[PDB]
Symmetry: C3
Amino acid sequence: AWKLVVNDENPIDVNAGSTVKFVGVKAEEGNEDSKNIKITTGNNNEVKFDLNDIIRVKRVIAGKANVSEVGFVITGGPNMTVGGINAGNKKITGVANGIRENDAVNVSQLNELKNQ
Amino acid sequence: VGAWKLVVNDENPIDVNAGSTVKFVGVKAEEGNEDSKNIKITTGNNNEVKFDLNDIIRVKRVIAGKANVSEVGFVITGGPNMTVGGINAGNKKITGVANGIRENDAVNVSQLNELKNQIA
Amino acid sequence: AWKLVVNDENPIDVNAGSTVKFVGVKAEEGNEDSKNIKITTGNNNEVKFDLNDIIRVKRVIAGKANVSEVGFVITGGPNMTVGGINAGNKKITGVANGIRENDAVNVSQLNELKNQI
């Protein structure tokens, strides 16, 4: 027999005739397509590990950038949440001229009015 | 060592005998890019098999409650979005906007008020 | 003994009495709850693999959409970064009337003035 230790847990004894099972945990209980870790096998019995095309988490952190249930947040910077967009006391650039009533307007549009 | 079996998500067992080799592999997300294995599997000391994410992960969707990342961009369900076709402010105000300067910068209320003072 | 080959690495030899350890790597050295890959065991000793509820990476790529240390970027399109927001040379829609000095203004508010002046 050999022993399999997962992180800090007590060893699993693997005897002759024993079965070891690997399981991708389902994020959503009825949904076999909801396993965040996708474990499959190859033609030569290779055990293959990947991510699901769709991953379900509570939070993604990449430096100051956060994705979570509240929205898209840059620590100390802009954000987008259910209550709307905060531009972080910075300019918003690359804005095409607004057309509909609830489109944003840009500097060029303010200037047009200023000359009429 | 005794002969044992490995069952992966209820696949038919893989029988492992004395003399057998078992391979674990991280799948490449991008066909020809060796650096694109989302699951980073390595070996260290003391027969440790170490599992982590790649520094760069490649997926089609991230779901974190009502916040969604996808090939179209960044969406809050029932809220604003920033997607390929543009920003949708979600029928909410946009706050914290510094004064626009270039012709394609957004303007703020302070600037609209400056104009009101200038025209008539 | 049997051998374990992980990707292109040298084989590990597993004899009778050997131990193999599976470990989640900590994303942050001081945080034992920062292991991106969550490995646990079930009530019949199944080895269960999942993601941490909180994952820490340098970049997520979903097609043109990127999450990274600079912020939220659509390649060739809109972005929201440490330096502010770019609207992608497209219109911004769904903007409620600005109120406070640093709120954005919409077409309706520009027209309201035009009708007064």
